[PDB]
């Protein structure tokens, strides 16, 4: 009866939440992707995706691809500043 984008795929090193309602995958529904905190940052977009008229989950910039969770580089346990 209406356009259905289906359950969205998972985000490696991340997570996905249904915003419009639980398991709601149909036209104009909204999901939110996020990356694991601290150790990763999300790169391409803000992770809000909408079930588009064309039947694809689509980012706020019109991308069909997942966000990418990029590891934060250069973290070390070494003490610095002479401590």
């Amino acid at each position: 009866t209406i356009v259905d984008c289906g359950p969205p795929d998972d985000l490696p090193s991340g997570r996905v939440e249904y915003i419009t309602g639980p398991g709601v995958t149909t036209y104009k529904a909204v999901i939110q992707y996020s990356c694991e905190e601290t150790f990763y940052t999300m790169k391409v977009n803000d992770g809000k995706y909408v079930c588009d008229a064309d039947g694809f989950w689509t980012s706020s910039k019109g991308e069909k691809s997942l966000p990418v969770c990029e590891p934060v580089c250069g973290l070390s346990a070494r003490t610095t500043g002479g401590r």
């Binding site: 590891p71 934060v72 580089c73 250069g74 346990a77 610095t80």
Partner: protein, 242 residues
């Protein structure tokens, strides 16, 4: 490493062991690439076996490591195996992304103004499992803090007879003390010489362990490292073109 001390967990989470016919090293970038020396991965082009890349451990002979494998190896086109040490840099594409943890985390690439943290006498850190003054490979990951040497001092040292002249280029940096002692040695090849960006409090790679005197830690020579900031477009174009 000569003149160093044991790494603690999480100190050098980029450090990887590359084990084959040789013992050598690299540094993790992102989650699916390893930066190393060209000389360290040259001989393996025609091998059946992928590179055996080991992450996440301090012990060289740890049975407990995170296994990775090469998928592709990119040696800089300007590397000439039979004619000197220029352009000693290579990128390895891993077959899968590694999951990051406290013991496995990539090193940052040098930013545009990284040279501000790599001035003459600024301290960099070499890490590795290479030759120590016990006379064996290190059982434990070692590190040493060493200063960047003035490029013309380094060039002059490697012009003093009997060293072979014309070995040190603009694509190299030198680190160590004039007196010798502290150094990177056989087995340390490919490791990252790292520096702290004190504005971000994040570590970046300034050098790759490359070459030096046959006798490590000798007075009158310095470890020589590939100068990574000169390769940023090459690195970027490889990790894009992929």
């Amino acid at each position: 490493i000569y003149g160093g001390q044991k790494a603690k967990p999480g100190d050098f989470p980029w450090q990887v062991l590359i084990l084959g016919g040789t013992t050598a090293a690299g540094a993790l970038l992102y989650d699916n690439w390893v930066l190393t020396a060209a000389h360290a991965v040259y001989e393996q082009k025609h091998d059946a076996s992928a590179l055996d890349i080991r992450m996440g451990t301090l012990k060289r002979l740890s049975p407990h490591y995170t296994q990775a494998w090469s998928e592709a190896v990119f040696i800089h086109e300007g590397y000439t195996h039979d004619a000197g040490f220029d352009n000693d840099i290579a990128l390895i594409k891993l077959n899968n992304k590694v999951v990051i943890n406290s013991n496995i985390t990539p090193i940052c690439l040098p930013r545009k103004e990284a040279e501000s943290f790599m001035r003459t006498d600024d301290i960099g850190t070499a890490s590795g499992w290479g030759l120590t003054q016990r006379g064996f490979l290190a059982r434990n990951l070692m590190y040493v803090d060493i200063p960047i040497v003035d490029h013309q001092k380094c060039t002059a040292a490697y012009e003093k007879p009997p060293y072979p002249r014309g070995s040190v280029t603009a694509n190299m940096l030198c680190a160590g003390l004039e007196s010798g002692g502290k150094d990177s040695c056989r087995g340390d090849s490919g490791g990252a010489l790292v520096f702290l960006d004190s504005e971000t409090e994040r570590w970046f790679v300034g050098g790759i362990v490359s070459w030096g005197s046959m006798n490590c830690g000798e007075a009158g020579q310095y470890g020589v490292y590939t100068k990574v900031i000169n390769y940023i477009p090459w690195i970027e174009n490889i990790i894009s073109d992929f």
